[PDB]
Amino acid sequence: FTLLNRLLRLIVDPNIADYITAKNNVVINFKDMSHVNKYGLIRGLKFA
Amino acid sequence: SHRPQLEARSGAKAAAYTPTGIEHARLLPGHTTLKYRKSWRKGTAFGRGYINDMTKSEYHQEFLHKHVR
Amino acid sequence: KGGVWTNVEDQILKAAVQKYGTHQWSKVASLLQKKTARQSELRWNEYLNPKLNFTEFSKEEDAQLLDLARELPNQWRTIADMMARPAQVCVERYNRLLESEDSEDEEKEMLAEARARLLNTQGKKATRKIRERMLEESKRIAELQKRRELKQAGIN
Amino acid sequence: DQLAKLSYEKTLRNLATQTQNSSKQDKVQKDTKTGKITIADDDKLVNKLAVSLQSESKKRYEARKRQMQNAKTLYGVESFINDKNKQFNEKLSRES
Amino acid sequence: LLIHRKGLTYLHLDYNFNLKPTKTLTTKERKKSRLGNSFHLMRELLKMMKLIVDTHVQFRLGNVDAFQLADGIHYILNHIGQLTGIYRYKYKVMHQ
Amino acid sequence: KIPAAVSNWKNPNGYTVALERRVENNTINDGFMKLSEALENADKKARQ
Amino acid sequence: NGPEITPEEATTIFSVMVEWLESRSFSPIPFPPLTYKNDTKILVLALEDLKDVYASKVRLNASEREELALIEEAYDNPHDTLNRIKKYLLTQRVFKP
RNA sequence: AUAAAUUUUUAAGGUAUGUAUUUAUUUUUUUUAAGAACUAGAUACUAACACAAAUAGUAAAU
RNA sequence: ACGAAUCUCUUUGCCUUUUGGCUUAGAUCAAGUGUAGUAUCUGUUCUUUUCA
Ligand SMILES: [Mg+2]
Ligand SMILES: [Mg+2]
Ligand SMILES: [Mg+2]
Structure with missing residues (x-):
């Protein structure tokens, strides 16, 4: 991410970018198992 | 009434019973017989085992790297 | 349909959690009306659960904060865990920390519902037994006083 | 082990007060017929024995009963659906 | 005898060894009355014998003729895959 | 001494229990510190 | 690491x-x-894209119905929603699971 | 100048299940409920009962 | 004086009606109506001793 949020600071307003990078970190719940997504990219996101 | 068992059935309980005499199939004679033993390339920006476990194995991580995808 | 939380339903939840445990939520939203599993558990983990830390800053927590939040541009749930503090609060108290820079009826009936629900532990089978057995007892007592009144006629 | 000893002592001294108190308030035969043995005993002291046992059963039984009363009336903290929640849950209080 | 001794009295064997219920069955009376791949296999087998032996019984009575006899029992041994239904019980027999 | 079982999942008699029977130490690696500040430096160089 | x-x-x-x-x-x-x-157009597009998931369906589950609601209103009140959004991007940084 | 031909069938998995159906005669010291009447409907559960007419406990649906 | 027995209370000990299994958390989770049966939720008005 921290690399992203920069690379997006390039091409888009710092807001929107922030909305994205921050849009990835989430909990992810399968049944019981759940974990923060600290690192990768979630593809199911409409803009992914 | 679903309960973890605390016990098992003594074979003896069976042993006292009288027989039946039903004939199975797998008891029919087989093997009646014993056996005895005796220029351009510079341009680009980049200038010059077995772990007892499963989920940390190299195989398993290949596998999960295929199928679940 | 857009909802918010009364302390009524909130308490009914904390009672429910206090029984069914966290992971059975779709039951916890049975007692509780108006609500869903993800709603229930959302409020629970993000707010209600007591083990959460709601308190002030400290200069450890602050210099810690501007440190982390500068290092990781927007990654709040990460940073949140890093602070062992809830997410939106760390976000909020953060923004505030840079804001120093400047230039009774059917609810009582649902409560009757749940309040009645918790207090029966058995399931259909056991209750059915209770009945069957008592019916047997009445049958016995009847048959007796049959025989008693027959004895008052002398015929045994 | 030690408990069984201690109880042995307690009923020793108690027995002593029985005998002495009975002073204050005041063989072996064999059958050549069968290997059964025959001892001769008073109907006394058997009754003191049995009675003592019965009264022990009583007093213990009653300590446990009054303990039921007190213990079940007092603690009012934890949630209870029924009796066994109070019981078990007080075991969980016994833990720490 | 085997049937009536399992207390199934509402099944009928006609003279051709078909097995028919005479009275719409209470489900319990179905379960109690499923019969085995034995009993059925054997009923079918008897059916085959009855069939052949009948055709002879006819010819002796003088109602047929020796050619129609021969053709008959030929027809039987070929069309067993129809006249009976033994192939329900040993399905193997679908080789023959 | 063995404790008593309180399991988030099953509750076979319906018993009720005080919640807390139902219910990290490390910091980051300076890999981060270096990362974000390096991105930062190259950034401000570039913008200048 | x-x-x-x-x-x-x-x-x-x-x-x-x-x-x-x-x-x-x-x-x-x-x-x-x-x-x-151009704005309303773009919003027409996106919303049709979500709509299409549910075009075919005959039974709608809970989350679904929740959705269709949110859509239908979004058609109804375009200025409302667009304002709602531009707000959301300007601010909200934390999200549901 | 080609002769190249697989198969074919039966059971199992509104309702199961359970209960009673005796007719024909076996010897003589305790204690307190606040009491009574009126009234309406509102949330519930249910019911093989009612909207060319039909579904059940191996399988379910864009 | 101390010793012992009895009654009562307190504390410790003992645990006294003191969580009994497995599989994809075992799976699924709200779309109706008419009448009818039962459950039970409010208010109103009057009144607080006894004997043959
Ligand atoms: Mg079955
Ligand atoms: Mg099976
Ligand atoms: Mg079944």
């Missing part, structure tokens, strides 16, 4: 994109403006 990139690689990459874009002479995107001339 920390992040993998190392700062070295990071900086090289960033600089790459930079020389590219400058060279490419590129203007970055602006925030969607409140006064927008």
Whole structure:
């Protein structure tokens, strides 16, 4: 991410970018198992 | 009434019973017989085992790297 | 349909959690009306659960904060865990920390519902037994006083 | 082990007060017929024995009963659906 | 005898060894009355014998003729895959 | 001494229990510190 | 173990994109403006895209119905929603699971 | 100048399940409920009962 | 004086009606109506001792 949020600071307003990078970190719940997504990219996101 | 068992059935309980005499199939004679033993390339920006476990194995991580995808 | 939380339903939840445990939520939203599993558990983990830390800053927590939040541009749930503090609060108290820079009826009936629900532990089978057995007892007592009144006629 | 000893002592001294108190308030035969043995005993002291046992059963039984009363009336903290929640849950209080 | 001794009295064997219920069955009376791949296999087998032996019984009575006899029992041994239904019980027999 | 079982999942008699029977130490690696500040430096160089 | 990139690689990459874009002479995107001339169209598109999932369905589950509601209203109150959004992007940083 | 031909069938998995159906005669010291009447409907559960007419406990649906 | 027995209370000990299994958390989770049966939720008005 921290690399992203920069690379997006390039091409888009710092807001929107922030909305994205921050849009990835989430909990992810399968049944019981759940974990923060600290690192990768979630593809199911409409803009992914 | 679903309960973890605390016990098992003594074979003896069976042993006292009288027989039946039903004939199975797998008891029919087989093997009646014993056996005895005796220029351009510079341009680009980049200038010059077995772990007892499963989920940390190299195989398993290949596998999960295929199928679940 | 857009909802918010009364302390009524909130308490009914904390009672429910206090029984069914966290992971059975779709039951916890049975007692509780108006609500869903993800709603229930959302409020629970993000707010209600007591083990959460709601308190002030400290200069450890602050210099810690501007440190982390500068290092990781927007990654709040990460940073949140890093602070062992809830997410939106760390976000909020953060923004505030840079804001120093400047230039009774059917609810009582649902409560009757749940309040009645918790207090029966058995399931259909056991209750059915209770009945069957008592019916047997009445049958016995009847048959007796049959025989008693027959004895008052002398015929045994 | 030690408990069984201690109880042995307690009923020793108690027995002593029985005998002495009975002073204050005041063989072996064999059958050549069968290997059964025959001892001769008073109907006394058997009754003191049995009675003592019965009264022990009583007093213990009653300590446990009054303990039921007190213990079940007092603690009012934890949630209870029924009796066994109070019981078990007080075991969980016994833990720490 | 085997049937009536399992207390199934509402099944009928006609003279051709078909097995028919005479009275719409209470489900319990179905379960109690499923019969085995034995009993059925054997009923079918008897059916085959009855069939052949009948055709002879006819010819002796003088109602047929020796050619129609021969053709008959030929027809039987070929069309067993129809006249009976033994192939329900040993399905193997679908080789023959 | 063995404790008593309180399991988030099953509750076979319906018993009720005080919640807390139902219910990290490390910091980051300076890999981060270096990362974000390096991105930062190259950034401000570039913008200048 | 920390992040993998190392700062070295990071900086090289960033600089790459930079020389590219400058060279490419590129203007970055602006925030969607409140006064927008095309806007309602774009919103028509996105919303049809969500709508289409449910076109076929005959039984709608809970989350679904929740959705269709949110859509239908979004058609109804375009200025409302667009304001709602531009707010959301300007601010909200934390999200549901 | 080609002769190249697989198969084919039976059971199992509104309702199961359970209960009673005796007719024909086996010897003589305790204690307190606040009491009574009126009234309406509102949330519930249910019911092989009612909207060319039909579904059940191996399988379910864009 | 101390010793002992009895009654009562307190504390410790003992645990006294003191969580009994497995599989994809075992799976699924709200779309109706008419009448009818039962459950039970409010208010109103009057009144607080005894003997043959
Ligand atoms: Mg079955
Ligand atoms: Mg099976
Ligand atoms: Mg079944």
